[PDB]
Each structure stands twice: as C-alpha cells, then as structure tokens.
Design an enzyme around this catalytic site. Structure first.
Site, PDB file in Angstrom:
ATOM      1  N   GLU B 167       0.832  -1.208   0.000  1.00  0.00           N
ATOM      2  CA  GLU B 167       0.000   0.000   0.000  1.00  0.00           C
ATOM      3  C   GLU B 167       0.863   1.253   0.000  1.00  0.00           C
ATOM      4  OE1 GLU B 167      -2.841  -0.329  -1.029  1.00  0.00           O
ATOM      5  OE2 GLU B 167      -3.899  -1.964  -0.028  1.00  0.00           O
TER       6      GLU B 167
HETATM    7  N1  LIG Z   1      -2.702  -9.293  -0.260  1.00  0.00           N
HETATM    8  C1  LIG Z   1      -2.739  -8.021  -0.709  1.00  0.00           C
HETATM    9  N2  LIG Z   1      -1.611  -7.390  -1.222  1.00  0.00           N
HETATM   10  C2  LIG Z   1      -1.657  -6.091  -1.678  1.00  0.00           C
HETATM   11  N3  LIG Z   1      -2.754  -5.286  -1.690  1.00  0.00           N
HETATM   12  C3  LIG Z   1      -3.880  -5.966  -1.158  1.00  0.00           C
HETATM   13  N4  LIG Z   1      -5.149  -5.466  -1.026  1.00  0.00           N
HETATM   14  C4  LIG Z   1      -5.900  -6.464  -0.476  1.00  0.00           C
HETATM   15  N5  LIG Z   1      -5.235  -7.598  -0.221  1.00  0.00           N
HETATM   16  C5  LIG Z   1      -3.943  -7.282  -0.664  1.00  0.00           C
END
Ligand SMILES: Nc1ncnc2[nH]cnc12
Ligand code: NA
Ligand code: NA
Ligand code: NA
Ligand code: NA
Ligand code: NA
Lengths: 70, 283, 70, 70, 70, 70
Positions: B167
């Site tokens: 993120e």
């Molecule tokens: N495992 C994951 N990796 C990266 N972004 C995500 N958003 C939701 N699950 C995720």
C-alpha cells in the site's frame, strides 16, 4: 432579484423537508423537493448558483435558482 | 527480480520504496516533479512477480531477516510470503497463477482479500496500528506460521506488512504517514479511514490519473485531490490501465466539469436520480 | 423542429416549478419534471442537447430533447 | 444538535423501510426517502455529513443533515 | 428478445414523456419513467446496455433493459 | 439470510418494474422503488453491496441491502 451568486458552501436537508444552501455567506432554503438533488449535484460539482427571490434576506426562502458552470 | 524494503530508518524505508517504484513503473508525463511522480506500473506478463526481502525490523541489524513477500508485479498484490529459513512460500488461494521456483509452495485456503484477512485477523484496517514493534511481532508470527490456512496472527501480520509495503508503494500518503513509526521515538502509525479509502480506490484512481492535464482538481469517488502536490503527496504508483481493475463499468474514464477531472462513474452515480418529488412519492 | 442544439449555457429552476435552459443563445423552459435532472446532468457532463418543439419561439416551452455525449 | 460528523461509512436500506447510515462510528437512520439519494451521493462522493437532531444518540432517526464537500 | 446490446448513441426525452435510446443503431423507446435517469447515466459513462423487447426493429418499445459492465 | 456480498455484475430493470442485480453470481430482484438509483450508483462505482433476504437462491427477492465503501 439575484440574492446571492456563488458556489454552495454547504447544503442541508431540514426536518421540515426543506433544504438549505449557503451561497456567498448567506443561507437560503427552498421547500421545492426537486431542488434537493439538483442543488447537491451543483454543490458537488462546484457550479455557480444564483439564488433568485423577491426577498433576499439571509435565512429567507427561494424557489428560483440558476445553475452555471465555470 | 528481488528488492529489499529496509525498515531501519525513514530514509532506508523510503529509499527502498522509491527504488522499487523506479524499477517497476514509469512516471506519468503529466504528474511528475523531479523524480517524484505518480508512475504507471510497466506492463509485465500476468504471473510476473518480484520478491521483497524484509530487512531492518531491528534497526540496521541482520536479524529477523527470513521474511520475503512475493508481489504480483502488475497489481502489487502480495501473493503470499516466503519463510526463507524453511524455504516455504505460503501462497494465497487467489494466486495459484504465481509460481515461485526453488521454494516449497504451500497453497493456502485463505485468499488475499482484505475482507478475508480482516475477518481472520479479527482486525479492521481502519484504526489498525502498526509500529516497529508490531512489525517485529508480525514477522515472528509469519515465521512461526505453518499450514495451508491463515491463522489470526498470520493474518494480522499480513495486514500490517501489506500496508507498509504494497500500500505504501502505491500511495505516497501511506509511505509518509507510516514512516514516522520508524523513527527513534517509535510512535505508532494508525491507519486512518482516509488511508483505507485510498487503498479501496486504487483501481479507480489508476484509471483517472493518466487523463490528468493540470486540471484544478481530481475527484474519484470519495477521493479528492485539489492540486498536483495533493496528487503527488498521495499517490505514487498506479495500475497500467491499458483483484484491482481499471474499469468498473462503462468506457469513459473521466469527465472534466468546472476544471475538475471527475471519474465519470462518480458523476454518473449522482446524476442518475429522477425528480425528487416523483422519487419520494412513488413508494 | 430543432429549436436549438448546443451545450447548455445555464439551467434554472423556476418559481413555477418549470425549468429553463439556455442553449445556443436562446432560453427554453420545460414543465416536465424529469427533464430537470436530465438537463442538469447534460449541462454538467457537457452533452450537446437538441431542444425540439413544434414551435421554437425564444422563451418558449419544450418537452422533447435529444441528448448526445458529443 | 450535531450528532455525528464525518463521511458515510456505509448506508443500508432495511426491510422495514428505514435507511441507516454510519457516520463517525455511530448508526442513525431516516425514513425520509428524500434523504436516500442525498445520503448515498454523499457517501459515494465522500462528502462530510453532519447528522443533526434535537437529541443526539446512537440509533435514533434523523431528518436533518448537512452536507459539505469537505 | 435481446434486441440491441451496446452503448447508448443518443437518448431523447419525448413529448409523450417516453424516453428513447439508440443502441446498436436502432432506436427504442420506453415509457418506464425510472429508466430515464438510469439510461442517461449509462449513456454518459458509456455503459453497455441490452435492450430487451418483443420486437427489435428500430422504433420498438421496451420495458426491460440490462445495464452491463462491458 | 446472508445472501451475497459483492459488486453488482449487472443490473436490470424488469417488465414488472422491479429491478434485479446480479451479485456473487446470483440474481436478486427488488420491487423497492427507492433502491433503483441507489443500486445503479453502486454498480457504477463498484460498491460492495450486501444483500440479505429470507431466501438466497438466485431469483429471490430482497429489500435489505447495505452499500459498503470497501
Ligand atoms: N494481499 C494483498 N496485497 C496487496 N494489496 C492488497 N489489497 C488487499 N489484499 C492485498
Ligand atoms: Na426569499
Ligand atoms: Na533507493
Ligand atoms: Na522506471
Ligand atoms: Na469510468
Ligand atoms: Na416550443
């Protein structure tokens, strides 16, 4: 007469089902239900609205309003 | 391809993320200043991934160094994690198309979604706290993890690591907020509703920003950027709009309204109301 | 007849609950309520509207309008 | 009085014809259909809404709410 | 039958309050009031719709339409 | 019963004026008029909707639906 012209600063649904908008520092309310979502669309999109009425005192009612884009 | 994300300091962490971004994405022509941009992930074959070696959980020490995340390159999803000590890749159920050579792959029953992870973790992302200490705890939980089904603690660890890696790679806002937890005062980063909202709108944002041409602002659903520094301060990497997807419905990325670039679907979603009086009375 | 074709220059909710739009320099009003959100949407998204009416006098009413994204 | 202020976390229409919204961690509901599109639009556009009532408490009905772009 | 599937090429509010959309080069009208804003929103965002009707020639009426994510 | 929680794959306005959405591979219809624009807005913005109803077989009706941002 043009009471106020500007962007909607905030809008507010009232308990009596009227709807208020604050334009150029003044609050105006309308009992026309149709205007509620139109004013919300205008507020969301930054339309310049011109509140028109025979009474322009802040806190007064209105049912005529022009919507302008930039 | 493998990259290290070093959590030793804010400098090493940000440097780590920037190096990843540079290698896997290309700056948008219209949203780039210096070498700080909103970049579009370079196209790679589906199944392509890059590994992220987690380092520096204990500042500058080669300790807690057996955790690797496997990230699907086109969407930055963490497909699973590798315990390099046991040479085991725990792969989420929705990533069976990601194959990692040389490791024993444990195909999990748990999928990668936040809906699932938050449930299994009994931890909501909004309000989730992440600190250097909880990343160490997260690391230990993942190293202790075994089995084909995520446990509560492994899920909490994945939630935390996904936030500070994938993120943060996507959103410079999360990189900025989270990195304070790496400082010597060791404060706690608390994921905000705004941080959560950003992550939930990555695909939508991705579809809109390539259309940006200096408009006064950008509106994508609940997301608003009032100027380019807001965009740059918030977003770093977006999907290549040529799991998250760029398109929800329709085929019109944007509509310029009063010098604001709107995701067209957002405008369509508040311009699809009929006359209010008819709406309310037609019960 | 095609009374006017172009972008909506301004729209306006009127005291008599009709709705006015200015297109290609002329104003037309409609009493059809569902045209209110339809016209505001066209104005906000930049649709070309073609106002149609048996008669097309400036400041005349209409209840037929075509909407085109382009 | 201002009951809750914040973006809408979720909205929900119930079989009993009440429409709930969660704002600042608290649920409130309204059966004013006029508020449904207004609230949902606020939710999907991330407006800050201020739920208002003569008395504020979790789970009470409301019919006054202010909408702000931010 | 599924008569036309594609984006709305133009829409038109008609004098009789019905509403027409042109899909896959054929015009279809509907008297379902609620479809007006829904079809216009589909139109502005380029949403693919499938017009379903007993007859598929241009000029046919419909009261069923599917909004697709294509 | 917890019928479905997911994005709207398609929506359809039905001949009987009810409105159907396909969510998690199953179709659910609602005769609740208030829900039509709300469901389409959810479809347009990819909102996750949670549909609950006495029965969850595809083709079941519902009135309860939650609009989530996640
Ligand atoms: N495992 C994951 N990796 C990266 N972004 C995500 N958003 C939701 N699950 C995720
Ligand atoms: Na007045
Ligand atoms: Na670097
Ligand atoms: Na690059
Ligand atoms: Na779009
Ligand atoms: Na006329």
């Amino acid at each position: 007469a043009d009471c106020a012209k500007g962007k909607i600063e905030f809008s507010k649904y009232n308990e009596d089902d009227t709807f208020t908008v604050k334009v150029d520092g003044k609050e105006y309310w309308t009992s026309r239900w149709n205007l509620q979502p139109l004013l919300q669309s205008a507020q969301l999109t930054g339309m310049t609205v011109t509140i028109k009425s025979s009474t322009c005192e802040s806190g007064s009612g209105f049912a005529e309003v022009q919507f302008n884009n930039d | 391809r493998e990259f290290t994300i070093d959590f030793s300091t804010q400098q090493s962490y940000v440097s780590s993320l920037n190096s990843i971004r540079t290698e896997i994405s290309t700056p948008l022509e219209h949203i780039s200043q210096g070498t700080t941009s909103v970049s579009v992930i370079n196209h790679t074959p589906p199944g392509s991934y890059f590994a992220v070696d987690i380092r520096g959980l204990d500042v500058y020490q080669a300790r807690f160094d057996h955790l690797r995340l496997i990230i699907e390159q086109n969407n930055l999803y963490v497909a699973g994690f590798v315990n390099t000590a046991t040479n085991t890749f725990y792969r989420f159920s929705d990533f069976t198309h990601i194959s990692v050579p040389g490791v024993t792959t444990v195909s999990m029953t748990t999928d990668s979604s936040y809906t699932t992870l938050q449930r299994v973790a009994a931890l909501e992302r909004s309000g989730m706290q992440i600190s250097r200490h909880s990343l160490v705890s997260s690391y230990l939980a993942l190293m202790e993890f075994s089995g084909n089904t995520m446990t509560r603690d492994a899920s909490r660890a994945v939630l935390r690591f996904v936030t500070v890696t994938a993120e943060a790679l996507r959103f410079r806002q999360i990189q900025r907020e989270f990195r304070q937890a790496l400082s010597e005062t060791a404060p706690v980063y608390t994921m905000t509703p705004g941080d959560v909202d950003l992550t939930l709108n990555w695909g939508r944002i991705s579809n809109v920003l390539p259309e940006y041409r200096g408009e006064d602002g950008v509106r994508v659903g609940r997301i608003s950027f009032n100027n380019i520094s807001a965009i740059l301060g918030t977003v770093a990497v977006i999907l290549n709009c040529h799991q998250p997807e760029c398109q929800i419905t329709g085929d019109r990325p944007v509509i310029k309204i009063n010098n604001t670039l709107w995701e067209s679907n957002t405008a369509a979603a508040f311009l699809n109301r009929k006359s209010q009086f008819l709406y309310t009375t037609g019960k």
